[PDB]
Amino acid sequence: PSAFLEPFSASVWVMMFVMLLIVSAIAVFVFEYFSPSFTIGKAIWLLWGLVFNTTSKIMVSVWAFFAVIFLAS
Amino acid sequence: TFENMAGVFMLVAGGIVAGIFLIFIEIAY
């Protein structure tokens, strides 16, 4: 079968695929919005570093709950 | 899909919104 797709996991694959994209976009937007540098160069890096083992970092840290919930699901 | 996916999506969205709102009001205050 295919890899990293519906046959491998997430038999529905109709809601989580866009959910992850929209939450990632929201996190990237709010990382720069709550800055007081590079959007895709730092926000995405922080997200991918928090999914696995200033105030912007603190507020992005809330997304670790979503990351662990997604991993458990 | 059905009730479970919608419920978990709403729960995580509400948690994220509450966290970002708390951070925003803390920064503003």
Overall residue count recorded for chain B in this entry: 29
* Residue type (1 letter), A11: S
| CA–CA separation, A63 and A29 (whole Å) | 13
| Radius of gyration for chain A, computed over Cα atoms and rounded to the nearest angstrom | 14
Q: Which candidate, A52, A5, A4, A50, places its Cα nearest to that of A28?
A: A50
- CA angle in degrees (0–180, nearest 5) for A53-A60-B22: 135
Two tokens at A9? Answer: 């996991």
Two tokens at A1? Answer: 């079968």
Which method was used?
A: cryo-EM
What angle do the packed helices A16-33 and B3-28 form, to 10 degrees? 0
> In chain A, which among 37-66 make CB contacts under 8 A with chain B?
55, 58-59, 62-63, 65-66
Two tokens at A49? Answer: 């570093």
Query: Which residues in chain A have Cβ-Cβ distances shorter than 8 Å to B23?
Result: 34, 55, 58-59, 62
* DSSP label of B29: -
| CA–CA separation, B29 and B20 (whole Å) | 14
C-beta neighbour count of B13 within 10 angstroms: 15
Q: Which candidate, B3, B26, B20, places its Cα nearest to that of A23?
A: B20
Backbone angles phi, psi at A64, to 5 degrees: -65, -30
CB A66 within 8 A of CB A26: no
| CA–CA separation, B21 and A51 (whole Å) | 22
Query: With an 8 Å Cβ cutoff, is A34 touching chain B?
Result: yes
